[PDB]
């Protein structure tokens, strides 16, 4: 018993072919079963034939005879059909409103999440379908991980390197950082966790959470979890106020936070606010300064990743009283300088998925590009707050969508918050990049910030681009451009000061080859997000949708504090780089 995801009409019916078993009202359930392949209907019991060894589960072929359900063949002489009068039978028949179209629900209930159009719909439907879409999608994602073969340690060739035997008749996951495994030790009559791991082509290189002397017969599965049902919306209803509400500004602020005082007042004068902070513009400085501006405010600092919560902790460690802070950790090494798991502390730092049920003066949700509507809903379900501040940058990278293959996901569809920031604009903008040379700031300002991003620094004159397609090879799930690495190696011989550079590419296999040939530290663009280096050498590797994605490119070139060399495949992005062109040797 529950509430029709289309009407809200109370019901005793959930579609049992739908992987999330959403409650459907007599009208909406009926319109659903008749217009799709979904015909299992669940109530107090499941609408299935109770006859001895009968397979009929289709609600349009079933009857309530006695107090059981039967198909045509096995029904008693006295019965009625479960599924007639443009409605399916169940409790609360009389209360039931239905919908003009069930078209959006049907698409969400039945899509396989491989088309961009599936995510576009999930982020433009009614709020209640946004929750059903986010649950349906996360469940589909978690089920897809079970499709992958077990990987087993066949041989231990060295430390940090392994030989893997793969389960037959199941596919193998890509071996990159977006696929975190769990090891397991072979025991008497069961198995125990031995940490979370990542793998990369060698044999395979393994980067584990903890060290071990892991031996043969240890095996790896992408640990999947239970997706809980969602209740709270992606955004609470917006409210604008005429005064600062439920907060009391400090009378003395330091010139270090003075640039944010107007924005801090805007936070206190609406229910939720969006802050777009391009790279190096002071997102975490903003977030911690809010605490100092409203010194009495209880603030929960959340984000999706331990790293993002940790960065907020590292900024708080500088500026806030340590004794007033707590890191929430569920029973991976994260921040260990605050007291642990003290919910009632003034300043709570905690990942979305570990949030306690509590209230707060302000909730700060950082790195919003990386949130899903699933995460947005969970924050609203766990935290009741006077104010919500959503900090991030719809021009940076979203959560990977493992199932997505046909089309690109635009920023307005990353989640509800990113949708607001791309359609109505952000409430607040940090307009001065402090990190990057002016050639990089100007480039991304035009590319993705509608020329609103301003440079603190001068031109470095250490920003270079080279147009070189080279040669692309593919391994199981990545790309390599040896000749592009060749160009970087030749550049390094004529410019050996660049040997302090970090090497960045859109591909782990490109990074693996560059590490061996160049000896630079390597980062995927996706793994460089939030980090900074003096010198960056970027090889585009390919001209794919992945390597040309403007958000990935933005993140790639904004890592550089001083200098950058971009070896480009794509004429388009090459031409948009406001950098000094270099000829090929
Ligand atoms: Zn269904
Ligand atoms: Zn039967
Ligand atoms: Zn309905």
Structure description:
- Zn(2+) 11 binds at residues 4, 7, 25, 28.
- Residues 1-112 form the CV ZBD domain.
- LRR repeats lie at residues 223-243.
- The protein is of the alpha/beta class and 585 residues long.
- The protein has a domain at 433-581: P-loop containing nucleotide triphosphate hydrolases (Rossmann fold, 3-Layer(aba) Sandwich), CATH 3.40.50.300.
- Helix content is 26%, strand content 22%.
- Strands 17-16-18-15-19-20-14-21 form an eight-stranded parallel β-sheet, sandwiched between helices. Strands 8-9-12-11-10-13 form a six-stranded antiparallel β-barrel. Strands 28-27-29-30-24-31 form a six-stranded parallel β-sheet.
- The termini are far apart.
- The chain binds zinc ion (3 copies).
- Residues 4, 6-7, 9, 25, 27-28, 98-99 line the site of one zinc ion (ZN).
- One zinc ion (ZN) is lined by residues 49, 51, 54, 56, 70-71, 73-74.
Summarize it.
With 585 residues, the chain is of the alpha/beta class.
What's the helix and strand layout?
Layout: E1 2-3, E2 10-11, E3 14-15, H1 26-35, E4 41-42, E5 63-65, E6 68-70, E7 80-81, H2 103-110, H3 116-122, H4 127-145, E8 151-155, E9 161-166, E10 181-186, E11 191-201, E12 204-208, E13 219-221, H5 261-268, E14 272-276, H6 283-293, E15 299-303, H7 306-319, E16 325-327, E17 339-340, E18 347-351, E19 358-365, H8 373-382, E20 383-392, H9 416-423, E21 428-429, E22 432-433, H10 438-448, E23 454-455, E24 463-467, E25 473-474, E26 479-480, H11 482-494, E27 502-505, H12 508-518, E28 522-524, H13 525-528, E29 533-539, H14 545-548, H15 550-557, E30 560-568, H16 571-576, E31 580-581
Bound molecules: zinc ion (3 copies).
């Amino acid at each position: 018993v529950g509430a029709c995801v289309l009407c809200n009409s109370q019901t005793s019916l959930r579609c049992g072919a739908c992987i999330r078993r959403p409650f459907l009202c007599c009208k909406c359930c009926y319109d659903h079963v008749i217009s799709t392949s979904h015909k299992l209907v669940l109530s107090v019991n499941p609408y299935v034939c109770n006859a001895p060894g009968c397979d009929v589960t289709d609600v349009t072929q079933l009857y309530l005879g006695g107090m059981s359900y039967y198909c045509k063949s096995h029904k008693p002489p006295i019965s009625f059909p479960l599924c007639a009068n443009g409605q399916v039978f169940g409790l609360y028949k009389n209360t039931c409103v239905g919908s003009d179209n069930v078209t959006d629900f049907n698409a969400i209930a039945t899509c396989d999440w491989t088309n961009a159009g599936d995510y576009i719909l999930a982020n433009t439907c009614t709020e209640r379908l946004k929750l059903f879409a986010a649950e349906t999608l996360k469940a589909t994602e978690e089920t897809f991980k079970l499709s992958y073969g077990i990987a087993t340690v066949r041989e231990v060739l060295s430390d940090r390197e392994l030989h893997l035997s793969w389960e037959v008749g199941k596919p193998r996951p890509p071996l990159n950082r977006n696929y975190v495994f769990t090891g397991y030790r072979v025991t008497k009559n069961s198995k125990v966790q031995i940490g979370e791991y990542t793998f990369e082509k060698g044999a395979v290189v393994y980067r584990g959470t903890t060290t071990y002397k892991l031996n043969v017969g240890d095996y790896f599965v992408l640990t999947s979890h239970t997706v809980m049902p969602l209740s709270a919306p992606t955004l609470v209803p917006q409210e604008h106020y005429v005064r600062i509400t439920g907060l009391y500004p400090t009378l003395n602020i330091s010139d270090e936070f003075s640039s944010n005082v107007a924005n801090y007042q805007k936070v206190g004068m609406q229910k939720y606010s969006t802050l777009q902070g391009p790279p190096g513009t002071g997102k975490s400085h903003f977030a911690i300064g809010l605490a100092l501006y409203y010194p009495s405010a209880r603030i929960v600092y959340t984000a999706c990743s331990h790293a993002a919560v940790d960065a907020l902790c590292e900024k708080a460690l500088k500026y806030l009283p340590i004794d007033k802070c707590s890191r929430i950790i569920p029973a991976v090494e994260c921040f260990d300088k605050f007291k642990v798991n003290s919910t009632l502390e003034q300043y709570v730092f905690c990942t979305v998925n570990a949030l306690p049920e509590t209230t707060a003066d302000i909730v700060v949700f950082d790195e919003i590009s990386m949130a899903t509507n699933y995460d947005l809903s969970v924050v609203n379900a766990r935290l009741r707050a006077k104010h919500y501040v959503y900090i991030g940058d719809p021009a940076q990278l979203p959560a990977p969508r493992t199932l997505l293959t046909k089309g690109t996901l635009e920023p307005e569809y990353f989640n509800s918050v990113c949708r607001l920031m791309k359609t109505i604009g952000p409430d607040m903008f940090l307009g001065t990049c402090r990190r990057c040379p002016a050639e990089i700031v100007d480039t991304v300002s035009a590319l993705v910030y509608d020329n609103k991003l301003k440079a603190h620094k001068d031109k470095s004159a250490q920003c270079f681009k080279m147009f070189y397609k080279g040669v692309i090879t593919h391994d199981v799930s990545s790309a390599i451009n040896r000749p592009q690495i060749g160009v970087v190696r030749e550049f390094l011989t004529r410019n050996p000061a660049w040997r302090k550079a970090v090497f960045i590419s859109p591909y782990n296999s490109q990074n693996a080859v560059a590490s061996k040939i160049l000896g630079l530290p390597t980062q995927t663009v996706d793994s460089s997000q939030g980090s900074e280096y003096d010198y960056v050498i970027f090889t585009q590797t390919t001209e794919t949708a992945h390597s040309c994605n403007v958000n990935r490119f933005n993140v790639a070139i904004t890592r550089a504090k001083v200098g950058i060399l971009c070896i480009m495949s794509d004429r388009d992005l090459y031409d948009k780089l406001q950098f000094t062109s270099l000829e090929i040797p």
